Design a protein around this nucleic acid. Structure first.
Lengths: 48, 75, 49, 50, 111, 122
RNA sequence: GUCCCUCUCCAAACGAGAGAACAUGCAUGGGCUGGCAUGAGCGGCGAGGGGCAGUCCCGAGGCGCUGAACCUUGAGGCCUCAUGCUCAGGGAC
RNA sequence: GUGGUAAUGCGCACUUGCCAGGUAACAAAUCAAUCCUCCCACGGUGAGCUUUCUUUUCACCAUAAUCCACUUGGGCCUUUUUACGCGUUGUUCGGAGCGGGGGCUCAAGAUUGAAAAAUGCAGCUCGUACUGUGUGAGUUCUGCGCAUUAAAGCAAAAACCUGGGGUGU
RNA sequence: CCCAACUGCAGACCGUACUCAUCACCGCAUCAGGUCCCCAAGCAUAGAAUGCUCUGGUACAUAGAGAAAGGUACACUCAGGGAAGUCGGCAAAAUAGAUGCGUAAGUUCGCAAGAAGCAUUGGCUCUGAGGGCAAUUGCCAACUCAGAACUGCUUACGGCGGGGAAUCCAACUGUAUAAUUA
RNA sequence: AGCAAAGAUCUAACGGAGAUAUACAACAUGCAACGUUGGAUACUGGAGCGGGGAAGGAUUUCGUGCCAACGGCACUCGUACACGAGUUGUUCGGAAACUGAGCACAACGUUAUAUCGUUUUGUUAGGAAAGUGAAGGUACUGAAAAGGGGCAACAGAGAACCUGGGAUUAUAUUCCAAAAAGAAAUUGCAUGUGGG
RNA sequence: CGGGGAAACCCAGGUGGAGGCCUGUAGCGAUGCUGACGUGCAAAUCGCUCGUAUGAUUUGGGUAUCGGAGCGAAAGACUCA
């Protein structure tokens, strides 16, 4: 998840916390480094 | 955390590569110079308010110097 | 006992009492001979007499 | 309990998805039979032992 | 009035390994904190009597591994194994028994 | 407690003696005195109240001078060679305010290490 | 005219009964009559005790005001001895 | 490698080639008893009570890991020699070395600092600045084992540790 | 190539909600049954008995009016007699804490034994005894026991043995027919 | 019939369709019941209708809406129903990597037939089960090591992390980012300086 | 520790804390009411009373032995009502 976040969005992920929902789907909280703005890459995708 | 005894150490440690900050705490009886480096937090207790100010200038302008104060709910 | 043991230690260390009479009292203090601290002292002061 | 194999966790993950009600539109298919979901479930009765 | 406390490490049973301190934190709250199992310490060999050695600390796993070699032993021969009396008996036996042979052997050869 | 006590010795209980010097407490009446709810009368009664109701050893109303009670300016002071708790003068003041029934109005709270200050409620 | 609603208790499991129907009827109060045993508060007898130099306090009990206080018709004691409430009684055959 | 008469101290190496031993490793009762809880003491802040009484009643008063530099209990060394003496609540001990002086070491703490007040808590001021911060009863962590009644004698192994020998030579 | 103190970068996998029970489990159920572990306050008291209480948690168990007979009860009482009741003292009553004195036959000498039985107990104001520490003297903590004077009892929470004389059987503790026999 | 163990509720204001509901005054003609907040009273009484875990359950957790059925009375409430959301770890538990009572894969032997037996008293198999490499010569030469592979502990062994918070509707020794609110511990590799 | 005795040994006061020891919680059981209930709270429960409660004790997880067989401090007990 650290590597594929470097490929797709070209932002380094300093910390990842995986989880598995009761649904079977595996969530992840990716913390992208303070040199990068996660509110920037969000609007690069979505979001609101 | 580690203690600094001589002042010839507090010059060496501040001039190490890793030390990213020097936190300066003012107490009634003394002032602490808390050097934040990678593994340990090195501190220096002066105890004489005259000698303290003079040290606070000799610190190289390279390293950040934070004045340690009470922080409220900025968040 | 803890009261009677400590009064004999305090005398032998202050040399009010011999090591020989200490051992004569120490063993009796265990024999329920001395009814209390004041009873021990009266018996010492009676030995010095 | 807190413990679970992951293989067992998923079987309850699937069974939680299957409890949803029958979509409203799917009643409107031409020649339709299904009305309410007959396989629905409640933990209070008929316990999966997974 | 006796704040009541809860286990934290996921094991809730109390055995000789789960022993717990009570702790009053700077937030003023009681807390279970796990004590550490503690080794019985370096001893002489069982056969010789199991008495503990001198100058040798009771350090446990990863405490004994990260400490300097001197806290675990002594400088004279058989440092962290045998007590001084057991060393000087094996120093004496090594000698007095060896000569009882050297004397009993010469007599046989001399004869 | 070493010597066992007696009832009948509850008259005249010894109080600990402050061996260093004087201790001084203040009761600052300025705020309510300004608005007239106090008067020169009640201030004469307030000092007198402590003069009558403070109990020195076991007994009240007789204070020889190991403790002196002074109304200088608008602020009451209590200077004491004895060891008192400052908590105890907060007690007597409230106990005075409840006779005058001023206590739904005037509150007391510690402004400084040796002093209390009469005030009003929000 | 009877029944319900309302109020009373010689009646009563619920029905039924005896009654009342702006009536000292109901309410509270007073006085009787009775039960208990002398209330709270305060004040100058007490084994002893503590201060200050005889006094001023601590002390279970005790004595005075004190046959005082409280209770007394309510599943329902007495006396009109006083005041209070009622202000076209409602509904059904 | 190197100091001390010694108990043992101080911080070039490698040793799972081999061997030997330790830790892991287990245990009553009595007595003392850690963290901590309760209670009392001291008195600081707010509150409760007030016809009378109550120097009053109630709440709070906190310091995590980590890392630095006196006391109690045991094992021991040297010294002087002991046959009556030392010692526990307690069923003990000594020429196979008691007791005394002086030392070495271990276990559990105490203390002073780093962390650490910049935090927590309470009060208050006109969403901010200030103010405050025990010879008592329990308690199995521990002392504590070649350690319990016993025709009961109280698991094992990884992993680690030190040594013997050797390598360095 | 090894060692030493730092520094640089990295530190993967699965569980993590909630429940653990007078409603979340098993007992066809939100069933007075059953179900392992940890933390455990104040007072009376020998106390984890039992009674009430501050923190925490509850007012959910279908309710209202309400004096019939007959019942059930983790509810009481009774004149005189006191087992005459009854298969049988079944059930109820009774005994009762602590302290002192006292205690039989029998006996494997251990017991029997709390045998049996007698007496004391409150409240208040005092007195004595029981210690620590420091340098005969000075200062202090925490409790227990005994004795006295005065004064009171309506014998008054909870809790808590009735006892004695003998016969039959099994030596004793233990186990034992889950749901009629311990 | 009955819905009778576990003491018990009361009042006011507000909510709600659930009212103060009327063809010549008010009682005599809209009864009973519901939630939340404040107040009162009471119970549990630390062996708890307190706070956390195992087994078992598996979304009951959390927020909004909602009253058809369901919670043997009642709901405006719910563990109902509907619609969204919620479970974050270098160190916590397991596994990677311990052994125990034990299990049975290989091997061997039986059996018409393996779907049978042996398989820890130090340990399989009539049984050639070592793929490692001391010293030495430059990836050969061969000392040394007897007894195959694995599973069985979420209470034994083993284990490097602690508090602070304004970090939540719901998770936390899990989250917090330059003053990390911060302080540490430890594993692997690597460069640099110091020594060998 | 003391007393007695020529001896052998015998008496008395303390300490100590033994036991398939006694009273009594939890725990584990299940005596009597032949109590409640007996279309129940319950296809064996409830109330008070009672047995034992440092031991041949109670208990969790794991593991072993079962159908003419298992296991049994023995009752035809128990082996998922």
């Amino acid at each position: 998840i650290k590597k594929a976040i470097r490929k797709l969005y070209q932002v380094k992920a300093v910390k990842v916390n995986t989880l598995i929902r009761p649904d079977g789907l595996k969530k992840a909280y990716i913390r992208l480094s303070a040199a990068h703005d996660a509110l920037d890459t969000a609007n690069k995708i979505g979001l609101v | 955390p580690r203690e600094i005894k001589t002042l010839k150490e507090f010059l060496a440690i501040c001039s190490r590569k890793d030390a990213r900050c020097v936190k300066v705490k003012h107490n009634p009886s003394a002032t602490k110079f808390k050097v934040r480096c990678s593994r340990y937090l090195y501190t220096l207790v002066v105890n004489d308010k005259k000698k303290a100010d003079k040290i606070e200038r000799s610190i190289h302008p390279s390293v950040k110097k934070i004045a340690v104060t009470a922080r409220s709910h900025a968040k | 006992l803890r009261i009677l043991r400590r009064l004999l230690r305090k005398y032998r260390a202050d040399k009010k009492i011999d090591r020989h009479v200490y051992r004569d009292l120490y063993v009796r203090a265990k024999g329920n001979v001395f009814r209390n601290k004041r009873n021990l002292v009266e018996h010492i002061h009676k030995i010095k007499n | 309990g807190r413990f679970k194999p992951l293989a067992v966790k998923k079987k309850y993950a699937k069974k939680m998805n299957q409890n949803k009600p029958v979509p409203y539109w799917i009643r409107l298919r031409t020649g339709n039979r299904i009305k309410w979901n007959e396989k629905r479930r409640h933990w209070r009765r008929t316990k999966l032992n997974y | 009035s006796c704040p009541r406390v809860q286990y934290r490490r996921r094991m809730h049973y109390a055995t000789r390994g789960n022993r717990m301190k009570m702790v009053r934190t700077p937030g003023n709250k009681l807390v279970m904190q796990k004590r550490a199992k503690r080794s019985q310490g370096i001893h002489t060999p069982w056969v010789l009597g199991h008495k503990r050695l001198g100058g040798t600390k009771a350090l446990r796993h990863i405490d004994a591994r990260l400490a300097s070699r001197h806290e675990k032993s002594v400088s004279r021969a058989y440092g962290g194994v045998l007590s001084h009396d057991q060393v000087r008996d094996r120093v004496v036996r090594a000698f007095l028994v060896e000569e009882q042979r050297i004397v009993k052997q010469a007599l046989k050869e001399h004869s | 407690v070493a010597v066992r006590a007696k009832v009948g010795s509850r008259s005249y209980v010894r109080q600990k003696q402050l061996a260093k010097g004087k201790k001084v407490f203040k009761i600052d009446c300025s705020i309510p005195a300004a608005d007239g709810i106090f008067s020169e009368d009640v201030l004469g009664n307030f000092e007198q109240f402590f003069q009558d109701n403070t109990k020195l050893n076991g007994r009240k109303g007789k204070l020889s001078d190991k403790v002196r009670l002074s109304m200088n300016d608008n602020v009451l002071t209590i200077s004491t060679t004895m060891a008192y708790r400052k908590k105890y003068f907060k007690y007597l003041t409230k106990k005075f305010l409840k006779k005058k029934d001023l206590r739904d109005w005037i509150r007391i709270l510690a402004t400084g290490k040796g002093t209390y200050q009469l005030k009003y409620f929000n």
